[PDB]
Design a protein around this ligand. Sequence first.
Ligand SMILES: [Zn+2]
Lengths: 20, 114, 36, 208, 87, 119
Amino acid sequence: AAPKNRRSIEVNRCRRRNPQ
Amino acid sequence: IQKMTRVRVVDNSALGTTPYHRPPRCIHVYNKTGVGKVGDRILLAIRGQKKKALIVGHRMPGPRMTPRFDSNNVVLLEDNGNPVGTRIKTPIPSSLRQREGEFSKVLAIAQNFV
Amino acid sequence: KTKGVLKKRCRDCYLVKRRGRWFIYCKTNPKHKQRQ
Amino acid sequence: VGLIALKLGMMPLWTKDGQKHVVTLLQVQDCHVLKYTPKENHNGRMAALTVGGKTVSHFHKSASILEFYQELGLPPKQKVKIFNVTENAVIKPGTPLYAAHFRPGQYVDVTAKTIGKGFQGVMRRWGFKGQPATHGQTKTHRRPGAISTGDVARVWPGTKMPGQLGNIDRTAFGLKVWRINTKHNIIYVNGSVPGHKNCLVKIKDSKL
Amino acid sequence: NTRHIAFSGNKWEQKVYSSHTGYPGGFRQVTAAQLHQKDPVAIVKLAIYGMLPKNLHRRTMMQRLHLFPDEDIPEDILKNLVEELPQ
Amino acid sequence: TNPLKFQIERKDMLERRKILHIPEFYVGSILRVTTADPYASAKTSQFLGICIQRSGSGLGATFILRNTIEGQGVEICFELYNPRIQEIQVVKLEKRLDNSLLYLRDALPEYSTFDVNMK
RNA sequence: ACAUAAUCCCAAAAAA
RNA sequence: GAUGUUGGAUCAGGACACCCAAAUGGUGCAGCCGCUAUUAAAGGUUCGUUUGUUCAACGAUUAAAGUCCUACGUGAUCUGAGUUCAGACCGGAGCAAUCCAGGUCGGUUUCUAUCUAUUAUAAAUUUCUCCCAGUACGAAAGGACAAGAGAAAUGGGACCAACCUCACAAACGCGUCUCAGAGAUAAUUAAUGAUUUAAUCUUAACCUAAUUAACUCAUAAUAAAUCCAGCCCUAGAACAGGGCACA
Ligand SMILES: [Zn+2]
């Protein structure tokens, strides 16, 4: 599969920081 | 006992000892489940004739308290549930007596019981 | 039995209204019982 | 009417009639009534049933736990559970109890933790048939296959899919008690019990 | 006294409250009668739940509303204003 | 848990050994078992045969017997502690190499030579 | 009498 | 600047114009079985032979072997049997290059999931056999409602003591065990005192006798946070859960 759209900065930060 | 499984006929006067080109097969079981056991009536096919027979033997006993026969044997009968043969061979389980008295004709004509 | 028009088949047929529906009851013959 | 027990093992029994009966054994180590909580809207009052191992006291450390055991004058305990008592007449204050509380011939319900299967496929959970293992089938064998329909985009909530199975609470119903041993604190229960041996179980009054 | 509420016409048995879950065929029909016999305070509350504008302020003002089937008011130990406008 | 299971075994064996005088037997031994279980007019059912497999477990310890009857093989499994069994008589004693006699299902003469060889 | 969750746009109402 | 067109497998959901199971009316309904119509979609609706079938014929059962929709559901799940294009023949058409909505054989099916969605609490469901009985009824043939009992089946949630696959003390069915009140309303339909309308009427009012599934519970599973380093586990992707007599 392929990504539908480019990732925003906010989502990237929230994904790469908080849960890990 | 399930369909396509070959069974042996112990009836001397019924389904004569002389073999055909096609061995006896089991078409269907009267039980709601495809797997039949001792005491259950089954519909078997022979060349030229399609008949009904009881199962007097099994190679896979469910309970530990029950005997196991090396070969699967059947006893031919009619719609009335009585043997059409005048003789029966090989031992027969004692469960057949517990079922009904009308079927005890087979038990009475049987040589031995296990 | 079930129709859109209910009329008396004979002189002994009786029309009643129950539960918002019309019904025909005849004691002489049961075949004359109708429902709307 | 009920008590907390511990799964021991299984074994066959022979009745004088000659009928075989497969039963399981539920051992009772220790039992004590801790707290009594009255209620109104529920029309029933709660009691505390507790089975301890007494060893866990040192390796399990908490303020409320230890203070509870100390203030209640209760010895160190491994497992503390609650039970709902509808009848207000049979309710008693804090008391130690024995496995003689159960009588033979009585049907009981058994609440325990089901065996954890860990992460499990679509098979062994919902019991799906799957695909064939032959006739050109490629890597579809244990796969669940299609899920939803083209009409509705999203998949319906509660759809059956592979995931973690077991390690949850389950209650078995209609289990008859053939006999009980007071001195050895053993309960003979006809049926199957959830979980492996030595896992905590619960014996309660059934509904018939 | 929300249970003492009176709906006119035949709407008592004829009013159907729909409650649907995520599961297929989870559509549930609860008549005003049975609902009154079970949870009456829900009815009037639902009548209010459709009046207010959507989004936040709906739930915000919804928390300002309390209903009881019978009269017990510990909040009446706290003095409040009483408004009477019967129909 | 486990020692309690051992206690189960001990209690069961006590209960059985007190009432039943039945001697200890091993796999590959020719035995005759009496059975009152069936509904036949004769209460005594005598079954002669050699034990192919015995795996002792708890009270449920069982042993499987096998013999040739009227040209047809007959295999009946009996519980050792089963109260239905009246008595058991040992006609002969053998050993072979194992607690598994399944290799006798083929009934080959070479294996029978080995069968005769050892004590 | 048609096939995913209801009401022919909310809730209700009445018969200048 | 592409919505990949049949069938099958897989996975379902829904409609009711109901095949079966349930509740009834009428019957040219004695009875048993049928016919016709009403209410009802909770569950179930089989296994094979011939041929690609959508079909159809046939075999054996079953309480029945329902119909339709979902892009004539479902190929970022599979299948290429059909058909949509490179060859080899028969037959027809054409002087020929070649065709035919005809029949025989062969013909590589590409993708690592970004978002949305999804990764279960439960209360069941269907059948056969036996008993009253071979009575009432009927010349004979024939021949229950209810109540009771014993077996399975499908399926829900399970377990490993025996048997079985088992080269450790594990996971499984092929093995074993269990499956439950109750309340209320369906649309039919059967009533009691009784008006308007001296009669009659189950309804207009009103106290009230009785009737499938759904729709609900008397209830059963749930929740004591606030240390957990480190060592282990039948627990486990991480995490979570459990157990180890800390300085
Ligand atoms: Zn008339």
